[PDB]
Coordinates of N, CA and C in Angstrom, one line a residue:
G1 N -19.6 -8.0 5.1 CA -18.3 -7.7 4.6 C -18.1 -6.2 4.3
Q2 N -17.5 -5.5 5.2 CA -17.3 -4.0 5.0 C -16.1 -3.8 4.0
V3 N -16.4 -3.1 2.9 CA -15.4 -2.8 1.9 C -15.6 -1.4 1.3
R4 N -14.4 -0.8 1.0 CA -14.4 0.6 0.4 C -13.4 0.7 -0.7
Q5 N -13.7 1.6 -1.6 CA -12.9 1.9 -2.8 C -12.2 3.2 -2.7
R6 N -10.8 3.2 -2.6 CA -10.1 4.4 -2.5 C -8.7 4.4 -3.2
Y7 N -8.2 5.5 -3.5 CA -6.8 5.6 -4.1 C -5.8 5.8 -3.1
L8 N -4.7 5.1 -3.1 CA -3.6 5.3 -2.1 C -2.7 6.3 -2.6
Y9 N -2.4 7.4 -1.8 CA -1.6 8.5 -2.1 C -0.6 8.8 -1.0
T10 N 0.7 8.7 -1.3 CA 1.8 9.0 -0.3 C 2.7 10.0 -0.9
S11 N 3.0 11.0 -0.1 CA 4.0 12.1 -0.6 C 5.4 11.5 -0.5
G12 N 6.3 12.0 -1.3 CA 7.7 11.5 -1.3 C 8.6 12.6 -1.8
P13 N 9.8 12.3 -2.1 CA 10.9 13.2 -2.6 C 10.4 13.9 -3.9
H14 N 10.9 15.2 -4.1 CA 10.5 15.9 -5.3 C 10.8 15.1 -6.5
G15 N 9.8 15.1 -7.5 CA 10.0 14.4 -8.7 C 9.2 15.1 -9.8
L16 N 8.7 14.3 -10.8 CA 7.9 14.8 -11.9 C 6.6 15.3 -11.3
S17 N 6.0 14.6 -10.4 CA 4.8 15.0 -9.8 C 4.4 14.1 -8.6
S18 N 3.2 14.2 -8.1 CA 2.8 13.4 -7.0 C 3.0 11.9 -7.2
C19 N 3.1 11.1 -6.1 CA 3.3 9.7 -6.2 C 2.1 8.9 -5.7
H20 N 1.5 8.1 -6.5 CA 0.3 7.3 -6.2 C 0.7 5.9 -6.3
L21 N 0.3 5.0 -5.3 CA 0.7 3.6 -5.4 C 0.1 3.1 -6.7
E22 N 0.9 2.3 -7.4 CA 0.5 1.7 -8.7 C 0.9 0.2 -8.7
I23 N -0.1 -0.6 -9.1 CA 0.1 -2.1 -9.2 C 0.1 -2.5 -10.7
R24 N 1.1 -3.2 -11.1 CA 1.2 -3.6 -12.5 C 0.7 -5.0 -12.7
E25 N 0.4 -5.4 -13.9 CA -0.2 -6.7 -14.2 C 1.0 -7.7 -14.1
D26 N 2.2 -7.3 -14.2 CA 3.3 -8.1 -14.1 C 3.6 -8.5 -12.6
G27 N 2.8 -7.8 -11.8 CA 2.9 -8.1 -10.3 C 3.9 -7.1 -9.7
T28 N 4.4 -6.1 -10.4 CA 5.4 -5.2 -9.9 C 4.6 -4.1 -9.2
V29 N 5.3 -3.4 -8.3 CA 4.7 -2.3 -7.5 C 5.6 -1.0 -7.5
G30 N 4.9 0.1 -7.6 CA 5.6 1.4 -7.7 C 4.6 2.6 -7.6
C31 N 5.1 3.8 -7.6 CA 4.3 5.0 -7.5 C 3.8 5.4 -8.9
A32 N 2.8 6.3 -8.9 CA 2.3 6.8 -10.2 C 2.0 8.3 -10.1
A33 N 2.3 9.0 -11.2 CA 2.1 10.5 -11.2 C 1.0 10.8 -12.1
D34 N 0.5 9.9 -12.9 CA -0.6 10.1 -13.8 C -2.0 9.7 -13.3
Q35 N -1.9 9.2 -12.0 CA -3.2 8.8 -11.3 C -4.1 8.1 -12.3
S36 N -4.0 6.7 -12.3 CA -4.8 5.9 -13.1 C -5.5 4.8 -12.3
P37 N -6.4 4.0 -12.9 CA -7.2 3.0 -12.2 C -6.3 2.0 -11.4
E38 N -5.1 1.7 -12.0 CA -4.2 0.8 -11.4 C -3.8 1.2 -10.0
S39 N -4.0 2.5 -9.7 CA -3.7 3.0 -8.3 C -5.0 2.9 -7.5
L40 N -6.0 2.3 -8.0 CA -7.3 2.2 -7.2 C -7.3 0.8 -6.5
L41 N -7.4 0.8 -5.2 CA -7.4 -0.4 -4.4 C -8.6 -0.4 -3.6
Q42 N -9.3 -1.6 -3.6 CA -10.5 -1.7 -2.8 C -10.2 -2.5 -1.5
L43 N -10.3 -1.9 -0.4 CA -9.9 -2.5 0.9 C -11.1 -3.2 1.5
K44 N -10.9 -4.5 1.8 CA -11.9 -5.4 2.3 C -11.6 -5.7 3.8
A45 N -12.5 -5.6 4.7 CA -12.3 -5.9 6.1 C -12.5 -7.4 6.4
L46 N -11.4 -8.1 6.7 CA -11.4 -9.5 7.0 C -11.9 -9.7 8.5
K47 N -11.1 -9.1 9.4 CA -11.4 -9.2 10.8 C -11.2 -7.8 11.4
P48 N -11.8 -7.5 12.6 CA -11.7 -6.2 13.2 C -10.2 -5.8 13.4
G49 N -9.8 -4.7 12.7 CA -8.4 -4.3 12.9 C -7.5 -4.8 11.7
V50 N -8.0 -5.8 11.0 CA -7.2 -6.4 9.9 C -8.0 -6.3 8.6
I51 N -7.4 -5.8 7.5 CA -8.0 -5.6 6.2 C -7.2 -6.1 5.1
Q52 N -7.8 -6.2 3.9 CA -7.1 -6.8 2.7 C -7.3 -5.8 1.6
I53 N -6.3 -5.6 0.8 CA -6.3 -4.7 -0.4 C -6.3 -5.4 -1.7
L54 N -7.3 -5.2 -2.5 CA -7.4 -5.8 -3.8 C -7.4 -4.7 -4.9
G55 N -6.5 -4.9 -5.9 CA -6.5 -3.9 -7.0 C -7.6 -4.2 -8.0
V56 N -8.6 -3.3 -8.2 CA -9.7 -3.5 -9.1 C -9.3 -3.7 -10.5
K57 N -8.3 -2.8 -11.0 CA -7.9 -2.9 -12.4 C -7.2 -4.2 -12.7
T58 N -6.2 -4.6 -11.8 CA -5.4 -5.8 -11.9 C -6.1 -7.0 -11.3
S59 N -7.0 -6.8 -10.4 CA -7.7 -7.9 -9.8 C -6.7 -8.7 -9.0
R60 N -5.5 -8.1 -8.7 CA -4.4 -8.8 -8.0 C -4.4 -8.3 -6.6
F61 N -4.1 -9.2 -5.6 CA -4.0 -8.9 -4.2 C -2.7 -8.4 -3.9
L62 N -2.6 -7.3 -3.2 CA -1.3 -6.7 -2.9 C -0.8 -7.3 -1.5
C63 N 0.2 -8.1 -1.6 CA 0.8 -8.8 -0.4 C 2.3 -8.4 -0.3
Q64 N 2.7 -8.4 1.0 CA 4.1 -8.1 1.3 C 4.9 -9.4 1.6
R65 N 6.1 -9.5 1.0 CA 6.9 -10.7 1.3 C 7.7 -10.5 2.6
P66 N 8.3 -11.5 3.1 CA 9.1 -11.4 4.4 C 10.2 -10.3 4.3
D67 N 10.8 -10.2 3.1 CA 11.8 -9.2 2.9 C 11.2 -7.8 3.1
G68 N 9.9 -7.7 3.1 CA 9.2 -6.5 3.3 C 8.9 -5.8 1.9
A69 N 9.1 -6.6 0.8 CA 8.8 -6.1 -0.5 C 7.3 -6.2 -0.9
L70 N 6.8 -5.3 -1.7 CA 5.4 -5.2 -2.1 C 5.3 -5.9 -3.5
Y71 N 4.2 -6.7 -3.7 CA 4.0 -7.3 -5.0 C 2.6 -7.8 -5.1
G72 N 2.0 -7.8 -6.3 CA 0.7 -8.2 -6.5 C 0.7 -9.8 -6.6
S73 N -0.4 -10.4 -6.2 CA -0.6 -11.9 -6.3 C -1.9 -12.3 -6.8
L74 N -1.9 -13.5 -7.4 CA -3.1 -14.1 -8.0 C -3.8 -14.9 -7.0
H75 N -3.3 -14.9 -5.8 CA -3.9 -15.7 -4.7 C -3.8 -14.9 -3.4
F76 N -4.8 -15.1 -2.5 CA -4.9 -14.4 -1.2 C -4.1 -15.2 -0.1
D77 N -3.2 -14.4 0.6 CA -2.4 -15.0 1.6 C -2.5 -14.2 2.9
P78 N -3.3 -14.5 3.9 CA -3.5 -13.7 5.1 C -2.2 -13.4 5.8
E79 N -1.3 -14.4 5.8 CA 0.0 -14.3 6.5 C 0.9 -13.2 5.8
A80 N 0.4 -12.7 4.7 CA 1.2 -11.6 4.0 C 0.4 -10.5 3.5
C81 N -0.9 -10.8 3.1 CA -1.8 -9.8 2.6 C -2.6 -9.1 3.7
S82 N -2.5 -9.6 4.9 CA -3.2 -9.1 6.0 C -2.5 -7.8 6.5
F83 N -3.2 -6.7 6.6 CA -2.6 -5.5 7.1 C -3.4 -4.9 8.2
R84 N -2.8 -4.2 9.1 CA -3.4 -3.5 10.3 C -3.6 -2.0 10.0
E85 N -4.7 -1.5 10.4 CA -5.0 -0.1 10.2 C -4.4 0.8 11.4
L86 N -3.6 1.8 11.0 CA -3.0 2.7 11.9 C -3.4 4.1 11.7
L87 N -3.9 4.8 12.8 CA -4.3 6.2 12.7 C -3.5 7.1 13.5
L88 N -2.9 8.1 12.9 CA -2.1 9.1 13.6 C -2.9 10.3 14.1
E89 N -2.5 10.9 15.2 CA -3.1 12.0 15.7 C -3.2 13.1 14.6
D90 N -2.3 13.1 13.7 CA -2.2 14.1 12.6 C -3.3 13.8 11.6
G91 N -4.0 12.7 11.7 CA -5.1 12.3 10.8 C -4.6 11.5 9.6
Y92 N -3.4 11.0 9.6 CA -2.9 10.2 8.5 C -3.1 8.8 8.8
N93 N -3.1 7.9 7.8 CA -3.3 6.5 7.9 C -2.2 5.7 7.3
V94 N -1.8 4.7 8.0 CA -0.7 3.8 7.6 C -1.0 2.4 7.7
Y95 N -0.4 1.5 7.0 CA -0.6 0.1 7.0 C 0.6 -0.7 7.4
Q96 N 0.4 -1.8 8.2 CA 1.5 -2.6 8.6 C 1.1 -4.1 8.7
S97 N 1.9 -5.0 8.1 CA 1.5 -6.4 8.0 C 1.4 -6.9 9.5
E98 N 0.2 -7.4 9.8 CA -0.1 -7.9 11.1 C 0.6 -9.2 11.4
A99 N 0.7 -10.0 10.3 CA 1.3 -11.4 10.4 C 2.7 -11.4 11.0
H100 N 3.6 -10.5 10.4 CA 5.0 -10.5 10.8 C 5.3 -9.1 11.4
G101 N 4.5 -8.1 11.2 CA 4.7 -6.8 11.8 C 5.6 -6.0 10.8
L102 N 5.8 -6.4 9.6 CA 6.6 -5.7 8.6 C 5.9 -4.5 8.2
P103 N 6.6 -3.3 8.0 CA 6.0 -2.1 7.6 C 5.6 -2.1 6.1
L104 N 4.6 -1.3 5.7 CA 4.2 -1.3 4.3 C 4.8 0.0 3.7
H105 N 5.6 -0.2 2.6 CA 6.2 0.9 1.9 C 6.6 0.5 0.5
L106 N 6.7 1.5 -0.4 CA 7.0 1.3 -1.8 C 8.4 0.6 -1.9
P107 N 8.6 -0.3 -2.9 CA 9.9 -1.0 -3.1 C 11.0 -0.1 -3.3
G108 N 12.2 -0.4 -2.7 CA 13.4 0.4 -2.8 C 14.3 0.1 -1.6
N109 N 15.1 -1.0 -1.8 CA 16.0 -1.4 -0.7 C 17.3 -0.6 -0.8
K110 N 17.4 0.5 0.0 CA 18.6 1.3 0.0 C 19.1 1.5 -1.4
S111 N 18.8 2.7 -2.0 CA 19.2 3.1 -3.3 C 18.7 4.5 -3.7
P112 N 17.4 4.7 -3.7 CA 16.8 6.0 -4.1 C 17.2 7.1 -3.1
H113 N 17.1 8.3 -3.5 CA 17.4 9.4 -2.6 C 16.5 9.5 -1.4
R114 N 17.0 9.5 -0.2 CA 16.2 9.6 1.0 C 16.9 10.5 2.0
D115 N 16.1 11.4 2.6 CA 16.6 12.4 3.5 C 17.3 11.7 4.6
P116 N 18.1 12.4 5.4 CA 18.9 11.8 6.5 C 18.0 11.3 7.6
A117 N 18.4 10.2 8.3 CA 17.6 9.6 9.4 C 16.3 9.0 8.8
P118 N 16.1 7.7 8.8 CA 14.9 7.1 8.3 C 13.8 7.1 9.4
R119 N 12.7 7.8 9.1 CA 11.6 7.8 10.1 C 11.0 6.4 10.2
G120 N 10.8 5.7 9.1 CA 10.3 4.4 9.1 C 9.2 4.2 8.0
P121 N 8.0 3.9 8.3 CA 6.9 3.6 7.3 C 6.4 5.0 6.7
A122 N 6.1 4.9 5.4 CA 5.6 6.1 4.7 C 4.1 6.3 5.0
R123 N 3.7 7.6 5.1 CA 2.3 7.9 5.3 C 1.5 7.8 4.1
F124 N 0.3 7.2 4.2 CA -0.6 7.1 3.0 C -2.0 7.8 3.3
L125 N -2.4 8.5 2.2 CA -3.7 9.2 2.3 C -4.7 8.6 1.3
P126 N -5.7 7.9 1.8 CA -6.7 7.2 0.9 C -7.8 8.2 0.4
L127 N -7.8 8.4 -0.9 CA -8.7 9.3 -1.6 C -10.0 8.5 -2.0
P128 N -11.2 9.1 -1.9 CA -12.4 8.4 -2.3 C -12.3 7.8 -3.7
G129 N -12.6 6.5 -3.8 CA -12.5 5.8 -5.1 C -13.7 4.9 -5.3

């Protein structure tokens, strides 16, 4: 079982500071600027090309719902928590639900400030954890 511990970091619109993926005990998901353990996710390799992300602090599995929303769960669901590893020539890494092909991104259904023209999924940088 190949597993690694790393912090998920994705750049976004100017704000208080950097934005790091953060999982709450309530099962909510959002970014963090204080960089804490909640933003520490241990990725486990289920099958070649497919991995799972478990929050060590919350011990909750991060799964994406059909609507494409992110949320922590007390149970493992391959059909939603299974993600595919994407590598860009630029050297960035992104995740996409293999089950339905839904893109992985922070919650925000049309509302927060977003530059013109939506590129699509947000880029994530995994820091050693």
